[PDB]
Design a protein around this ligand. Structure first.
Ligand SMILES: OC[C@H]1O[C@@](CO)(O[C@H]2O[C@H](CO)[C@@H](O)[C@H](O)[C@H]2O)[C@@H](O)[C@@H]1O
Ligand SMILES: OC[C@H]1O[C@@](CO)(O[C@H]2O[C@H](CO)[C@@H](O)[C@H](O)[C@H]2O)[C@@H](O)[C@@H]1O
Ligand SMILES: OC[C@H]1O[C@@](CO)(O[C@H]2O[C@H](CO)[C@@H](O)[C@H](O)[C@H]2O)[C@@H](O)[C@@H]1O
Ligand SMILES: OC[C@H]1O[C@@](CO)(O[C@H]2O[C@H](CO)[C@@H](O)[C@H](O)[C@H]2O)[C@@H](O)[C@@H]1O
Ligand SMILES: OC[C@H]1O[C@@](CO)(O[C@H]2O[C@H](CO)[C@@H](O)[C@H](O)[C@H]2O)[C@@H](O)[C@@H]1O
Ligand SMILES: OC[C@H]1O[C@@](CO)(O[C@H]2O[C@H](CO)[C@@H](O)[C@H](O)[C@H]2O)[C@@H](O)[C@@H]1O
Ligand code: NO2
Ligand code: NO2
Ligand code: NO2
Ligand code: NO2
Ligand code: NO2
Ligand code: NO2
Ligand code: NO2
Ligand code: NO2
Ligand code: NO2
Ligand code: CU
Ligand code: CU
Ligand code: CU
Ligand code: CU
Ligand code: CU
Ligand code: CU
Lengths: 341, 341, 341
């Protein structure tokens, strides 16, 4: 027992929600214990019911958000149940050495492993499966990716000596999918990941996804699963993309404070319209809602947003501010005396 | 009449030019009145005469640049003449609430609407049509996008307490187009936007444009329409892309001061070769010309620049500086005594 | 002889290595003399032996890294031997005027030219061939691109008044290739660049590379050609991409200090997971190795990394630090008493 620190078990929750944590803490470093269970399963990924052979951490795309503080140790038990067909591992971009932990975590079905990494670098970071060779992109684009947030012990700041505190946090994992089609253009179904591989790899090679989704499917965060907020709340939106670039935008809002490269040692940028998540990274945006109503959160390639699945909704309760925006005149017939050339 | 401020009507001009404005102002906030008239029309988009069914604000791709100051109110009359076939609206990324104004501006042919938004955020911002669902990307990639610049009341600064002033401003709107082809590879023509939709959507879904153009067509800002400047002038180049990333570069020059995310609350970066406009944003670069001659302004995917339409020219008058660059020896035969392995 | 400065001849070396230079210097400005010889040749670009008709500076993809200091003059002799078939030139993104020098350097086979440019802007910069029109992207994606680094005379700094010094430097040139295929999907071979052009241009137009390689071929910097380092060394990794975006990541490491836009007048960002090289630029990352072993350096589109060629290896000698990372329990059977739902 070389490392003599208190241990705290964390119970992960499904995205887009985040497990209970403190922003600022005066507790000393701890060993933060997490469990991730690989689950291969067929999943529905669009509003027409298209299925595909997914591979997940903890049954979700993305995998759950892990939250720790700078100087904590993160002890992760990775479990690969014998119902799975493939070997799996885990690479933490937050971690130092052994390909992020991938070189120390390769497990066959029926096995588990325990990795410990010190949280020396602050920010939001991707984690993903990376078995080796062509299996690396396949496992990642099959769903095996999530994120971890390493907070400064004093919480977030604006890079100019002022504390920032969020009232709410959501984790938006964006997933690029490569679903094979038949000669007529219909999506193909398979009985196992292995059976889907060869056809999937051919789609992957042309670098054009068939779907780009938040929280694992088109429409996942719309309708009854819209994200809630209230006028005045400061909301942190963590966005990850393990394989492909994204350009997040909150329609009707802004990024008040944005860490587009995702690392809290760097001052955020202010007042952004659209920000950029480089493939293989996580970023974070804070926004204080000023108006009630529906907001769309998109990647601002609008073809991907509207036609390939990459739109979420916020439903924000409160009172409308006519000073910031008003409909001066409702739609009305163009006046007869108008000249509109 | 709740809002008791002076009103000023602005007459928009066609890009790449910009309407008359002040950089720094000591005037107080005003209500700045703008009119945008939707025009659906067939337009020529390449040097071989390819046409396509465009949808525009004020008859241009991009729509005109609107320029106001922080704290002004922007009162926009959007007009959809009865000669048009589709409903249209407007989303200002500069604005707060109601999906940028889209939720308050949906008008059928024969209607107009008046929206007012407070200019609380400084920078250059996209505006675009966003009717709903799949119509959002279609209207945007059909040409319905422009930009607005919200200047600080004191004008631009270098983020380190020094004023920056431009001698000239140009607005470069970049447009990704998705023109259908027949089985032989020739571009298809249609009699209406509605007729073009189904085939266009199929091209859009594969996320590869057929054309990438500045000011609405290949060659628009070359030849007799090159952009003018003079040695010593500080030129602001505003660049927008409503749907797709771009990587601007001034061949033979630099970005002296670049706001790649486009927001003046952030200090610019200095001395860039190439900068990055994330899809769904505007950015801005200042450059002081040091040499006369022709400059090419490109997106630095050179296939897009040279082969899909995305090159503009500057023609810069003045005297050559041999200290910065000189041809020491003109092309000459390789000397006989040379060894060139 | 207007310009009365000392002259120093530099002998270039093949990437990923870099010619001998000083980081900080107290020498005054000099005329730094470089020679680049164009070589058109067939080259092997993947592990299955696929060939293609390359065009290079000095026989390598990328062309060699040139290193000078701010205020030096760079006198480049460009040679186009009569064994070549095409005209060639050179555009330095570091240079001011005449399209970066392209407008002063066009040479036919059998000719040479001498260009001098003043190194007024600090950073890493692309150089590339740019003959005119469609020949520009073709020559660049055929291999005619490299980089130059213009160091501050005091060496690198952290943007906060502290010197940074590298123990080692590597230059990683990333190349997007567009190799034609026959109706069965096999790569086509040609006897000359001219013969390959028409088919290559058709691939280029669809903006999807067939290969994305470091140092000119899949596997170039893996196996016996892995990059060496030692625990404790600060390694500068210069990354260029003349045509297409990249997202570098050091698997198991970080970017301690990253200039993603590549320009040393801007403070670096700290502690990045993944950074972004915009097409038509160079960037640079410093990392101090903390753990021994194999590291993969990738573009973090993992399909491109694992399946299209874009992976390099570092082999790092030293002692493992169990505090930063440890395997707490090796892979073992899932305990009978476990519940893993
Ligand atoms: O800021 C640059 C810095 O990163 C360093 C910090 O000095 O270390 C990072 O990783 C180390 C792992 O132990 C820690 O010192 C540090 O707390 C963390 O940010 C150096 O390697 C370098 O100067
Ligand atoms: O996309 C090609 C072509 O395929 C068809 C079926 O023949 O539709 C498929 O592709 C659509 C777009 O991805 C999906 O909306 C649908 O689930 C799928 O069957 C055609 O309708 C389409 O033109
Ligand atoms: O700098 C962060 C800041 O944005 C705020 C300014 O305090 O507001 C922005 O939008 C508001 C709309 O009224 C204005 O206060 C402000 O002038 C503008 O930049 C906050 O919501 C937050 O601190
Ligand atoms: O691009 C496919 C194929 O189509 C042809 C006509 O058969 O040319 C078309 O496409 C060209 C590239 O976009 C355009 O230059 C031209 O306007 C268009 O007819 C072929 O020439 C080409 O191989
Ligand atoms: O920092 C902005 C600055 O770039 C300037 C420097 O004043 O010049 C750059 O190019 C010039 C070429 O002579 C040099 O003055 C300078 O050393 C270099 O960084 C201006 O044109 C402008 O303020
Ligand atoms: O990629 C299309 C198709 O072509 C084949 C040969 O018919 O393989 C070629 O393409 C592969 C992927 O790029 C390469 O691995 C190989 O060198 C090449 O012959 C098929 O195997 C493949 O499905
Ligand atoms: O140690 N107190 O939270
Ligand atoms: O299945 N993912 O939220
Ligand atoms: O672990 N690879 O399928
Ligand atoms: O109020 N004067 O410009
Ligand atoms: O048609 N646009 O400039
Ligand atoms: O308004 N949509 O076509
Ligand atoms: O001038 N001395 O290095
Ligand atoms: O051939 N290039 O390293
Ligand atoms: O110089 N062009 O082939
Ligand atoms: Cu896996
Ligand atoms: Cu990774
Ligand atoms: Cu419209
Ligand atoms: Cu938008
Ligand atoms: Cu060339
Ligand atoms: Cu260039």
């Amino acid at each position: 027992d070389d490392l003599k620190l208190p241990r705290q078990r964390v119970d992960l929750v499904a995205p887009p929600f985040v497990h209970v944590h403190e922003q600022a803490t005066k507790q000393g470093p701890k060993i933060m214990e997490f469990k991730l269970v690989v689950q291969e399963k067929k999943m529905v990924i669009d509003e027409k019911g298209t299925t595909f052979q997914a591979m997940t951490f903890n049954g979700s795309m993305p995998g759950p958000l892990m939250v720790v503080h700078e100087g904590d140790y993160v002890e992760v038990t990775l479990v690969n149940p014998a119902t799975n067909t493939m070997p799996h591992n885990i690479d933490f971009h937050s971690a130092t050495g052994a390909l992020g932990g991938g070189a120390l975590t390769l497990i066959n079905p029926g096995e588990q492993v325990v990795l410990r990494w010190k949280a020396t670098r602050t920010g939001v970071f991707v984690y993903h499966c990376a078995p080796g060779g062509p299996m690396i992109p396949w496992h990642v684009v099959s769903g095996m990716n999530g994120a971890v947030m390493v907070l400064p012990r004093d919480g977030l700041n604006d890079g100019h000596g002022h504390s920032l505190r969020y009232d709410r946090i959501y984790y938006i994992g964006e997933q690029d999918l490569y679903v094979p089609r038949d000669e007529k253009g219909n999506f193909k179904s398979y009985d196992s990941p292995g059976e889907a591989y060869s056809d999937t790899e051919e789609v992957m090679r042309k670098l054009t996804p068939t779907h780009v989704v938040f929280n694992g499917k088109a429409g996942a965060l719309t309708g009854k699963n819209a994200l809630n907020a209230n006028v005045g709340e400061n909301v942190l939106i963590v966005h990850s993309q393990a394989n492909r670039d994204s350009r997040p935008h909150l329609i009707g809002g802004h990024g008040d404070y944005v860490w587009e490269t995702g690392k809290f040692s760097n001052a955020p940028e202010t007042g952004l319209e659209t920000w950029f998540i480089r493939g293989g990274s996580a970023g974070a945006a804070l926004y204080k809602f000023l108006q009630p109503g529906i907001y769309a959160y998109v990647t601002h390639n609008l073809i991907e947003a509207a036609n390939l699945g990459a739109t979420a909704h916020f439903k924000v309760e409160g009172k409308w501010n006519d000073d910031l925006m008003t409909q001066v005149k409702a739609p009305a017939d163009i006046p007869t005396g108008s000249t509109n050339e």
